[PDB]
Amino acid sequence: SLSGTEQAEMKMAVISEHLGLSWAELARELQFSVEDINRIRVENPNSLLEQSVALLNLWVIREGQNANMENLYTALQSIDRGEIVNMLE
């Protein structure tokens, strides 16, 4: 399969566990609206993990068939979290 889609589940599970405070910046980098980002905050107020999982789930839905993990990697590197990419690739 494409290097940009294989094992998406495990990769996103790991990314979500490691994002921590970085998920909101990632969301902005991925072009999500301030409304969507705050909705995630209010729906999952006590867990950075839940907020991160929610964001990646929203991304999977938005991208649909055009989803490409390389876009997540580029965004991660742009927000200084390239160490997550190194761990995965």
Would you list the domain boundaries of the chain?
A: 1-89
Pick the CATH number of 1-89 from 1.10.1060.10, 3.30.70.2740, 1.10.533.10, 3.40.50.150: 1.10.533.10
Contacts by residues 10-16 (CB-CB < 8 Å, ≥ 24 positions apart): 11/69, 11/88, 12/56, 12/60, 12/72, 14/84, 14/87, 14/88, 15/52, 15/56, 15/72, 15/76, 15/84, 15/88, 16/49, 16/52, 16/53, 16/55, 16/56
CA distance 75 to 84: 11
Q: Which token pair is 2? A: 């494409």
Contacts by residues 82-89 (CB-CB < 8 Å, ≥ 24 positions apart): 84/14, 84/15, 84/18, 84/19, 87/14, 87/18, 88/11, 88/14, 88/15
Deposited resolution, Å? 1.9
Residues 6+ apart with CB under 8 A from 48: 19, 20, 21, 23
Q: Which token pair is 24? A: 């909101």
